[PDB]
């Protein structure tokens, strides 16, 4: 976490405005899609196992 703190401190504008926000948005979208797919598959497989 020291590297992250140093980055967010030294580079307040060159990373937060463009890099951090876009990386976080892409990650959150990818994990949301993954969670939705996993939930659908889990529901179908649970119906099958019932």
């Amino acid at each position: 976490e020291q590297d992250g703190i140093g980055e967010e401190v030294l580079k307040m504008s060159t990373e937060e405005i463009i890099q951090r926000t876009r990386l976080l948005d892409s990650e959150i979208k990818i994990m949301k899609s993954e969670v939705l797919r996993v939930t659908h598959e889990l529901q179908a497989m649970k119906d099958k196992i019932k």
Partner: protein, 87 residues
């Protein structure tokens, strides 16, 4: 005026907290998948094993021809029976 460094640090902390929460949700889902994969494998194996019939156990008394044997079931009766080809 709040410092831009402080604003960036607070935003990073909030984003990290949200990422940790979603990672906890993903870990719960991964544990669910791990358990349910084995549970479904076991259920499928049980369903497959249900549709299997046994086999009478007997003793061979004599071979009459290539495809004809005299077999005595442990029950008592004696039968003339065939033999599976690749045996």
């Amino acid at each position: 005026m709040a410092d831009p460094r402080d604003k960036a640090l607070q935003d990073y902390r909030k984003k990290l907290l949200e990422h940790k929460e979603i990672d906890g949700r993903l870990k719960e889902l991964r544990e669910q998948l791990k358990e349910l994969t084995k549970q479904y494998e076991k259920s499928e194996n049980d369903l497959k094993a249900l549709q299997s019939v046994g086999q009478i156990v007997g003793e061979v008394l004599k071979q009459l021809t290539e495809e004809k044997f005299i077999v005595k079931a442990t029950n008592g009766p004696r039968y003339v029976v065939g033999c599976r080809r690749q045996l």
